[PDB]
Design an enzyme around this catalytic site. Structure first.
Site, PDB file in Angstrom:
ATOM      1  N   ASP A  13      62.543  64.654  26.665  1.00  0.00           N
ATOM      2  CA  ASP A  13      61.898  63.341  26.779  1.00  0.00           C
ATOM      3  C   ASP A  13      61.966  62.540  25.474  1.00  0.00           C
ATOM      4  OD1 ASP A  13      61.017  64.279  29.440  1.00  0.00           O
ATOM      5  OD2 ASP A  13      59.432  65.328  28.338  1.00  0.00           O
ATOM      6  N   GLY A  66      47.312  69.591  22.547  1.00  0.00           N
ATOM      7  CA  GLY A  66      48.222  69.060  21.535  1.00  0.00           C
ATOM      8  C   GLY A  66      49.694  69.087  21.890  1.00  0.00           C
ATOM      9  N   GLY A  90      52.489  69.061  36.889  1.00  0.00           N
ATOM     10  CA  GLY A  90      52.277  69.031  38.338  1.00  0.00           C
ATOM     11  C   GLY A  90      51.036  68.288  38.797  1.00  0.00           C
ATOM     12  N   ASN A 130      50.380  58.460  38.158  1.00  0.00           N
ATOM     13  CA  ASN A 130      50.180  59.428  37.103  1.00  0.00           C
ATOM     14  C   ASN A 130      50.284  58.787  35.725  1.00  0.00           C
ATOM     15  OD1 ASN A 130      49.958  61.718  35.573  1.00  0.00           O
ATOM     16  ND2 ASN A 130      51.734  62.763  36.477  1.00  0.00           N
ATOM     17  N   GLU A 186      60.137  58.562  37.820  1.00  0.00           N
ATOM     18  CA  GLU A 186      59.371  58.656  36.581  1.00  0.00           C
ATOM     19  C   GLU A 186      60.130  58.030  35.411  1.00  0.00           C
ATOM     20  OE1 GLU A 186      58.567  62.849  35.916  1.00  0.00           O
ATOM     21  OE2 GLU A 186      60.685  63.385  35.949  1.00  0.00           O
TER      22      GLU A 186
END
Length: 300
Positions: A13, A66, A90, A130, A186
């Site tokens: 990511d 964290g 999830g 989300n 997403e």
């Protein structure tokens, strides 16, 4: 046997920034992970970004300790804004936070990350989106907007108050996968180029190693809120999108994208599940160009 592989590093990511001819990569990791390159080709692992793991986050998201997801980085008026995700896989008991800094060089005496607390939250069994995967995007009037979201109803858009952290109204769903559930969408990312805003989204399934099918799609709109569409007029809210990164000779899946313009060149950055490392998530950077009709196209 220990190895980093500076020219082909593990990353998940990722998001990128440049200051004083140095490239900075921020990724999913403890306290937000970091990397450093002088030329965007050879990378060096750094310290976690967060000076400490904020209390408000650990409280609002039970389980969060964290290990932070999908940061977003950008500079506006000599201030660097880093948005970050707090969640547990999830589930949608999540919160997006913001922190700011004057500089990105950690050897600088001006270097200090001030956390600014919560931007937006999603709560279990209640919110139909989300609160992860944030992206800050400015309009032509200079006002901040945020995109975020992953599964459930899909990709959210909301205008932010000038403090960069409090939303104005409610969000509005802006892109869908079809029609957690099966709305596999997403990692939204919006950029301004030419007459249009381009929303980049990730479709399908990350996080499954060599069995991931993650891909990246794109659509466009002249207005920031306005309906996002693909090459043949289909609305992203209904499942429109042009696939631009995909199953490859090199990758099972490529996704969680971002785009930057450096020295007149647009670059598409993502992570790919590399076949040469049986599905390890590696850094993917491709040169991106816009064609005659104004649609993004990638190299390789």
């Amino acid at each position: 046997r220990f190895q980093f592989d500076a020219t082909n590093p593990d990353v998940h990511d990722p998001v990128m920034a440049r200051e004083d001819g140095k490239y900075y990569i921020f990724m999913t990791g403890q306290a937000v992970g970091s990397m450093t390159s002088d030329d965007m080709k050879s990378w060096t692992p750094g310290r976690g970004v967060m000076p400490e793991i904020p209390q408000w986050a650990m409280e609002a998201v039970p389980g969060y300790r964290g290990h932070t997801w999908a940061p977003d980085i950008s500079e506006h008026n000599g201030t660097w804004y880093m948005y970050y995700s707090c969640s547990t896989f999830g589930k949608n008991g999540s919160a997006i936070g913001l922190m700011t800094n004057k500089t990105l060089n950690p050897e600088s005496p001006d270097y200090k990350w001030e956390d600014k607390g919560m931007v937006v939250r999603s709560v279990q069994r209640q919110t139909n989106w989300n609160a992860i995967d944030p992206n800050l995007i400015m309009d032509e009037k200079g006002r901040p907007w945020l995109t975020w979201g992953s599964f459930w109803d899909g990709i959210q858009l909301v205008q932010l108050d000038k403090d960069f952290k409090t939303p104005k109204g409610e969000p509005k769903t802006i892109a869908r996968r079809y029609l957690a559930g099966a709305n596999a969408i997403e990692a939204p990312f919006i950029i301004r180029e030419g007459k249009y805003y381009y929303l980049f989204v990730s479709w399908d399934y990350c996080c499954k190693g060599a069995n991931s099918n993650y891909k990246t799609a794109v659509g466009r709109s002249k207005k920031i809120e306005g309906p996002y569409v693909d090459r043949n007029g289909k609305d992203m809210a209904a499942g429109g999108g042009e696939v631009i990164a995909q199953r490859d000779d090199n990758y099972f899946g490529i996704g969680h994208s971002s785009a930057y313009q450096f020295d007149g060149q647009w670059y598409f950055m993502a992570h790919g599940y590399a076949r040469a490392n049986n599905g390890a998530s590696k850094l993917v950077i491709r040169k991106m160009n816009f064609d005659k009709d104004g649609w993004p196209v990638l190299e390789h």
